[PDB]
Symmetry: D2
Subunit: 418 residues, 4 copies
C-alpha cells in the first residue's frame, strides 16, 4: 500500500553503524535485526529530534564547547536563544520544583510523573518554533538557528530498563536532542547521619544506557546519550554483585540491606571508563566546582578513551565570588573546555532567574507600587540595544503571526509578501 | 446513610442571602431552590476556594487597597507572597503566552484550552501550600498567610453561558478566590483598518455574570465576581438587539454582520452601571493609565452605586516614565485607591520579569560565562536581607519537608519536635 | 546548516496543487506563497497524518464505500481494525460524554477542552501502533493495515478561524487522516419552545473550511476535509448578512438577536453547493435515516458537482427496527454508497457498546456473581473463531513486545529471530 | 484570620485513634504530633474521599461481602452502580492497557505515569456525580447511593516511600475510598526461564503501608488500606536482609544479584501476618482460583488475627466453565465471603466487556452493516426493563441537566420545581 514511514532494512541500519563516524566507538550489544523487529511496519519520523541531535553532535565538534542554562518554560528557552546560546538544558530538578505534571512543588528525588520532562521538551520546541515563525514573517535573520538542540534530564529513568526505554522514546517524540541518565536510586536516598545517595550496580547503569540507545535506534534518530555518575558523594550501593564495584565496598551493610561503599573520584573514574563504550558524553556529578578534580577525572578517562567527550554542571549553589577571584570565575568554562568538557551548563539558572526577578519586583512593588515596575520596564527598554524584543509583548507571543493567519484566511484582505 | 457533604436546604441558603452582609446589593435572578436543584445529593467542600474568597472579601474592606502581580508559575506566586503581597493575579494573557495546556505560545484571543487557567490556579495553590508546609516545620512565622487569595482571568468564558459555568466551576475546584469576566468576543477580533474588538450585548454579559455567580452558588463558595468591560476601545458589537446598547450603535453593519458602535468612556460607564448588580467589582479595560479618566469613570459609577468597588489594571505596556513624572508614578495606586479601585494589578508582571531576567542572564552568559551567573547570585545573596530564601534551593522546594516525611515513616528514625 | 525539515518552495507547492489529482476541484483562496510564509524555517513531518490521509483518499476511490464506528478508547479502535474495519471514526459527542480532558461527562455543546479530540486521535494511533508491533513480532499478517485512517470530529472549531486552525493543526500532529467541521454555534443552542440549533453564515463556514485546509497545507499533509451542514433542523442563524442565506430568512429576529430561518433539505442543498469547492466530502446532518431524502440531497448536489463525494452518519438513536424492515436495514449502506455517500459511520457505536456491555455484565454480576462473568467469557472464547484475540490479555496489551525489549536490552539473553 | 480548614490538634487526633473503633488493631509507628507537623496551617477537606472511605468501611461490616468489577471509564462505573453494584474497582492493569496519561498501551509493569490512576479516580467520581445530578432533577430515587466507594490499584507506589506517599495523597485528592499496595518490584521482573516476579523485603512493604497510612492521616480521611502479597508466584526477592524472609531464601543468587526464594502459600501467610497490623484488608494475589488455598490462607491469618478482613481477585483469565461446574461457579464468591474475603472483584471486567463488545459489533458491522448495530440497539431496548437508561443517550450524558442550568440562568424562562 503506502510506502510512508517504511522501516529501513537491517542491512541498511548495519551499514550506517559501520560507516557513519557518528557511531565510531559506540558499542551496541543488540543487533540491527533486533532494532528492526521492534519497529512494527511504520516508523514515525521525529523531525525535531533528528535535527536537534544532528546539530548538537556537529556543535560538540565545531565549537570550543557548547554551553547552556536550565530552562523550565518556553519563553525562558526563547530568550536563551535570542541572547545567543546554542543549546538548551532541560533540568529535571527545575521541573520537579516548578514545572511537572503533578502540579506539585518537589525536591529532586524522581517524585514527579515520568512524562513531565518530555512535556516540557515539547513545550520548549513549540516556543522556539513560534519565535522561528515570527522571525520569518518579520524578515528577522539575526538568529541563525531558533531550533537550538535540547539536552534533557532523564534522572535514572523512573524504574527499570523498560521505564528508561519509555522515557527516552517520549523525549524523542517531543523533539529532544540529547538525554542524560545517572546511576543512583534516588527513591531510596537515606536521610541524615550515615545516609546519602544509593548507587546501583555498574552493570545496571550499562543496562540503562543500553536501553536509552535502543529506544533512539528503534525511533530512528541519532540522540546524544549522556551518562552521569553519582559516585563522587554516594556512600551506599544496592548490591555488591558487580565485581567492578567490589573494590569500593567496605563490608558494613545497612538496615535496608544496602552496602557501604567508598566514595570519591576513584569510583567515578572507574564507572566512567565502564560507561564510555555506552555514552556519547560522560558526566561526573559534583557538588563543589574543582578544576583539579575535573582535570584528574578527564585525564584518567581520556588515558583510556582519548576521544571521549565529557559534560560538566557548573554549580548553581557554590558561592563563586567568596571562593574564587574574578579571573578564575571568568576562565572556568574555557579551562574545562580545554580538558574535554564539551557540554557545560548551569542546571538551576532558570529557577534562580525566575525566583529572584519576581521576588525583587514584588518586594519593590509591595513598598512603592508602580515605581518598582517602572524600574524593570526601563531595564527592558535598555536591553533592546542588545536585541531584547519582549517589550513588544503582543509581537513576542505571536499576535502578528496569528494576524497573518487571519489575513491569509480572509479573501477580502491581502498579506504582505516576504 | 452518610451525612458527609449533605446539601443545605433552600431555606438555609435564602437565609444567608438575606442576612449575610456579603450579599448586600447582590442580584440573583434565579432562586435558592434553583441552586439546590443543581447540587445532586453531595456537595464537595472547596476549602481553598472558600477560604480564599472570604479572605479576599475582608481584605478588600480592611486594606487601603489590594494589589497584585500576574503570576504564571507556582514559584512566582510564592515569591510574591514572600515579598509581602496579599493576593495573586493569574493572567490569562500570560497563560496563553507561556503556561497553557496546548503547549503552544499564543497571543490573547481565547486560543488555549479552556481548562488552562484552572490548572494554573491549582498549581499556584499547591506551591503556596508547600511554602506553608516548609514554614511550619521551620518555625517560620514571618509570613502570616501563605494562602493568598487568587484572582483569575476567565476571559469571556470560552463560549456561551454553559462554557462560562464550567470554567467558574473548574476555577473553584482548583481553589480560586475570585474571577473576572469580560464582554467581548475575542475570537472575532478584526485585524487592521477599521477592525478592533467586538463587544457582545449588555444582556449577554449579564448572562455571563449570572452564570459565574450560579456556578459559585452551586459549589457553595462566596467567590468574588469581577465584571470587565472592553467598551473603551471596542468598535464593534455582535448585535444591536439590547436597547441599552442602541445609544452607541452607528447604524452601520460590516461585511461580517457586526454593528459599528461608538466607543470611549461613555459606553463603559453605562455598561458598568448595568453590570453593578451582578458584580462584586467592576473593571474598565483601558490602554492609557490616566488618573483623571479613572476619576471620571469612578465618580460616574459611584453616583449611581456609591458602594461599588472597582478594579484597575495598571498597563504593563504603557511607557510610564515617558508620559508621567516620577511623582505621579509613585502616587498612582494610592490615588486610585482613594477613588474606590480596591483591587489593582499589573497583568503581565510575570511575563516581563521572566523574559527580562532570562535574556539578561543568558546574554551575559553567552559573552562571559560564569561571570554573568555570579552577578545574579550576588543579587540573590543581597536579597536575603529582604527575606529572600531561594538561595537555599533544596529547602525552597521542600527537601526538608520530604526528609521529614521520610523520617516520620522510618520507625528507626525520630523526628525533632516542632 | 541542517537540511532536516527544510520547507518546499512556493513553486513546488504550486506544482503539486496544479498537477496532483488529489487537488482537482479544490479551491484555495490563499496562495502557495502564503503557505510558505507561515511555515518558519523547519517543517515537522507528520508521518501518521500523511499516511492516514493518503490511505483514506485512496480507499474512498477504491472501495465501494468506507464505513466506520465511533471509537473513544484505543482498545476500541484496535478491535474495530481486528474485526475488519478500514477506518476509525472519532466522535466528539463520545469524547464529551466519556473521554475529554476536563474529566467531566458532558452533552454535545462544545463544552470540553478544545485539545480533547486531538489527544484521543494520538491515543488511537498509539494503540493501533502497538497492535502493529505485536503482530510483527508474532508473525501475524492477518491484518494488512493496522494504521487505519482516523476521521475526527472538529465540532465547529471551538471559536473563530484561529481556533479552527489550531484544532486542525493539533489533530494533524496527533496523526489524524481527516476532520469534519460544521456550520452551527452550539454554545448558543436555544432550549425549549421555539429554540433549536443556531447556524452561522455560509461565508463564515467557508472561512472555517478554508482555515482547516490552510492548517493542513502549512503542516504539509493532504488531510481529508469534510463539511457538515446542520441546516436540516436548525431554526436560527446568527446573521442575515450573507445573501446566500437570505432566501431562508423569515424576517423575524429573536430577543437574543438571532434570525429565524427556514430549515429542511433546501438550505442543506444550497449550503452543500456553496461548500463543495472547499470540502473533500459533504455531510448533511439528519435525524431520520431515509434513503429517499438521501437520494434527493445526493442528486441535487451532484447535479452541480457530479464528482462530489458525500459522507453519511447512520443515526444511533433512530429506532431502526420500529421504522424499517430488516431488508431495508440490511441494504441501507449499500444503497447509500450507490448514491455517492462514500464515507459512512455510526457516531455513537462505542458509547452504546461500552454502556450496554457493562450494564449487562454488572447486572448479572450483582445478581449471580461469577455466573455472569462466565457468560461473557464464553462469548469471548467463541469469538476467537472470528479472529478475536483479547482473551490472551497479556499479549493483547504488549507483554510479549515489552518482554522482547527487555530481552533485547539484556546481553545475557538472546531474542528469537523473527 | 480565617478558621477555614484549621488543623485538628494532636490531642484531638490521638483521641480519635484511641476511641474510634475504625482504628481498632491499627498500628501507627509515628505519632499524632508527627501527623500534625506535616499539615501546614490549612487542611483541605476531601469530601468524596471521606464519604467513600466511611461508606466502604460500613459496607464491609454490614454486607455479607462487597463485590466490584474493574472500571476504566466514567460511563463504565455509572453503569455498574446503575446495575446495582455498591463499590467500584479501579484496576491499574486496565489503566496501563487503555487509560493512562502516556497515551500508550502497556502491559502491567508500572510503566505508566504515576498520577494516571488518580486521574481515573477523579473521572469516575465526576461521572457518578453527573448521574447523581441527573437522578435528582429527574426525581429518580431508584439508586440510593450514586457515589459508590472506589478502591484503587496503587501498584507498589512507583518508587520508594515518598512515591507511595504522593500516589496515596493524589488518590485521596481525587476521591478514592481505598487503595491497595503490593510487595514486588515490577520494574525488575525477570523474563523467561528461571525469571519471574521479584519481591521486596517484608520490612519494605511495612514501610509502604506505613507511608500509605501516613498520607491518609495527613490528608485527614479514613482511607481503607489494602495490602497485597505477591509471594504466591514470585521466585525472587531483592535482598535477604529481613530475617522474616530468610526462611524461604535458598542461597542461589542471580546475575542481577537477586536471591532465589521458595514461593507458595507459606510465604504469603507469613507476609500476611506481618502486614496485618498495617492493613485494613489483606490480599493474596493468585493465578488460579482455588477454594482450598483460599481457605488455608484465611484460616492461617485469622488464627492470629481473628477479625482481619481479606480481599480476593476472581481470576478474569481462568477458564471457569472448563474447570468447574455451574453450581461451584455460582457459589464461589459466597463461599469466599464465609471465609472472611469481604472485598471481592474481577480486575479486568471492563477490559473484557469493552474489547469484546466492540469486536462483536464491529465484526457484524463489517459483514452486515446496519443489521449488526440494530442487534445491539434491540438488546439495549430490552435492557430498559432491568433499569438501563443509556438508550436515552442525551439524557445519559447530562443534556437535561445542562438545559436546566441554561434555563436557570435565563430570566425569561422558569425551571420546573422538584
Ligand atoms: Mg535529579
Ligand atoms: Mg484576555
Ligand atoms: Mg457535535
Ligand atoms: Mg499491577
Amino acid at each position: 500500500a503506502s510506502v510512508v514511514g517504511t522501516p529501513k532494512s537491517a542491512e541498511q541500519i548495519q551499514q550506517e553503524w559501520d560507516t557513519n563516524p557518528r557511531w565510531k566507538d559506540v558499542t551496541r550489544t543488540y543487533s540491527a535485526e533486533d532494532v528492526v523487529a521492534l519497529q512494527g511496519s511504520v516508523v514515525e519520523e521525529h523531525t525535531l529530534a533528528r535535527r536537534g541531535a544532528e546539530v548538537l553532535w556537529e556543535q560538540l565538534h565545531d565549537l570550543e564547547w557548547v554551553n547552556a542554562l536550565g530552562a523550565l518554560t518556553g519563553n525562558m528557552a526563547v530568550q536563551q536563544v535570542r541572547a545567543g546560546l546554542k543549546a538548551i538544558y532541560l533540568s529535571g530538578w527545575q521541573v520537579a520544583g516548578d514545572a511537572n505534571l503533578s502540579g506539585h512543588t518537589y525536591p529532586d528525588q524522581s517524585l514527579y510523573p515520568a512524562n513531565s520532562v518530555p512535556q516540557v521538551v515539547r513545550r520548549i520546541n513549540n516556543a522556539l518554533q513560534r519565535a522561528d515563525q515570527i522571525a520569518k514573517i518579520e524578515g528577522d535573520t539575526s538568529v541563525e538557528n531558533w531550533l537550538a538542540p535540547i539536552v534533557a534530564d532523564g534522572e535514572a529513568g523512573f524504574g527499570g530498563a523498560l521505564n528508561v526505554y519509555e522515557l527516552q522514546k517520549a523525549l524523542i517524540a517531543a523533539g529532544v536532542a540529547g538525554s542524560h541518565w545517572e546511576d543512583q536510586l534516588a527513591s531510596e536516598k537515606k536521610c541524615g547521619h550515615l545516609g546519602g545517595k544509593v548507587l546501583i550496580p555498574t552493570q545496571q547503569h550499562i543496562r540503562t544506557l543500553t536501553s536509552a540507545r535502543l529506544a533512539a535506534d528503534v525511533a530512528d534518530v541519532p540522540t546524544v546519550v549522556i551518562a552521569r555518575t553519582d559516585a563522587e558523594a554516594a556512600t551506599l550501593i544496592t548490591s555488591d554483585v558487580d565485581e567492578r564495584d567490589q573494590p569500593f565496598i567496605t563490608g558494613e551493610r545497612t538496615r535496608e540491606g544496602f552496602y557501604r561503599t567508598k566514595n570519591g573520584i576513584e569510583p567515578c573514574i572507574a564507572r566512567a571508563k565502564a560507561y564510555a563504550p555506552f555514552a556519547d558524553l560522560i558526566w561526573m556529578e559534583t557538588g563543589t566546582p574543582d578544576l583539579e578534580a575535573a582535570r584528574q577525572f578527564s585525564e584518567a578517562v581520556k588515558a583510556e578513551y582519548p576521544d571521549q567527550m565529557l559534560a560538566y554542571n557548573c554549580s548553581p549553589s557554590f558561592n563563586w565570588k567568596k571562593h574564587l577571584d574574578d579571573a578564575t570565575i571568568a576562565k572556568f568554562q574555557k579551562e574545562l573546555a580545554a580538558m574535554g568538557f564539551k557540554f557545560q551548563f548551569i542546571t538551576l539558572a532558570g529557577f534562580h532567574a525566575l525566583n529572584y526577578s519576581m521576588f525583587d519586583l514584588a518586594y519593590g512593588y509591595a513598598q512603592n507600587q508602580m515605581s518598582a515596575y517602572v524600574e524593570l520596564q526601563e531595564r527592558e527598554f535598555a536591553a533592546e540595544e542588545r536585541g531584547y524584543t519582549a517589550t513588544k509583548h503582543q509581537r513576542e507571543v505571536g499576535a502578528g503571526y496569528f494576524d497573518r493567519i487571519a489575513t491569509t484566511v480572509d479573501p477580502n484582505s491581502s498579506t504582505t509578501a516576504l
